[PDB]
Write a protein that binds this ligand. Structure first.
Ligand SMILES: Nc1nc2c(ncn2[C@@H]2O[C@H](COP(=O)(O)OP(=O)(O)O)[C@@H](O)[C@H]2O)c(=O)[nH]1
Ligand SMILES: [Mg+2]
Length: 199
RNA sequence: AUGAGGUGGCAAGAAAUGGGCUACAUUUUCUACCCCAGAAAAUUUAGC
């Protein structure tokens, strides 16, 4: 309700959003009529990127699995032809937000090979997952490395699971069980969580 | 002529039994990957 549009958006000949209306209306038009949902998303982005520059609010763009934008799609036409990511309006409008042509906010993203298309299981580095086009788009950027648990973090996570009584095996609270879990997971948070799930 | 040729004709149906070929899925199927993802929907024959 505080954020308001600066243009007249025409959903159809009968319905339009007038200048100065709250942004929520636009969202509502996307939530009520799905036909205009995709058009409603882009407008929101178009507004949020612009108004944040004016200084009305601070904007955070949190995109998880950002590598999808500059890759390949598994969506097909009716002629069984491949569709490129840029041919999707939802993907096309979200690329404009990743460009550093606006101020008043920060862009944070996380890579992900899980659910990625046409990538090997062991690819995790920025260029390998992003592609040349993705690296060129994001460049310049600050990469931040996320690693496996160090011994302090591993011990604290196991203590958290024990405090929640989530390790029911009698040998789990002992020290030998902790060494075995450490070796089996290699301090990987996801493998440790999955192993502790059924113990 | 138990050799070589010409002409036409010869098309088959019933059960009772034996075998063979196909698909038969949720512990499944399609895509990415090659395993931390997303969507769809009783008799009897052998073997160890
Ligand atoms: N239904 C509707 N959608 C709009 C309208 N204006 C912008 N949009 C959508 O909001 C997005 C804003 O992105 P934009 O700045 O216009 O980039 P452009 O598509 O290349 O012109 C567009 O991609 C449209 O999908 C409008 O007047 N009516
Ligand atoms: Mg005959």
């Amino acid at each position: 309700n505080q954020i308001k549009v600066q243009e007249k958006y025409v959903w159809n000949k009968r319905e339009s959003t007038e200048k100065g209306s709250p942004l929520g209306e636009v969202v509502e038009q996307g939530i009520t009529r799905v036909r205009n949902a995709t058009d409603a998303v882009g407008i929101v982005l178009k507004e949020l990127k612009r108004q944040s520059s004016l200084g009305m609010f601070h904007l955070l763009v949190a995109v998880d699995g950002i590598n999808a934008l500059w890759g390949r799609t598994t969506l097909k036409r009716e002629d069984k032809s491949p569709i490129a990511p840029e041919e999707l309006a939802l993907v096309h409008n979200l690329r404009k937000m990743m460009k550093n042509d606006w101020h008043g906010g920060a862009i944070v993203s996380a890579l992900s090979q899980t659910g990625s298309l046409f990538k090997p299981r062991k690819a995790y580095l920025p260029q390998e997952l992003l592609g040349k086009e993705g690296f060129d788009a994001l460049d310049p950027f600050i990469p931040i490395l996320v690693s496996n648990y160090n011994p302090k973090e591993f011990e604290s996570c196991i203590q958290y699971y024990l405090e929640n009584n989530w390790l029911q095996h009698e040998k789990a609270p002992t020290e030998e069980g902790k060494k075995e879990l450490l070796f089996l997971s290699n301090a990987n948070p996801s493998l440790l969580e999955r192993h502790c799930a059924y113990l």
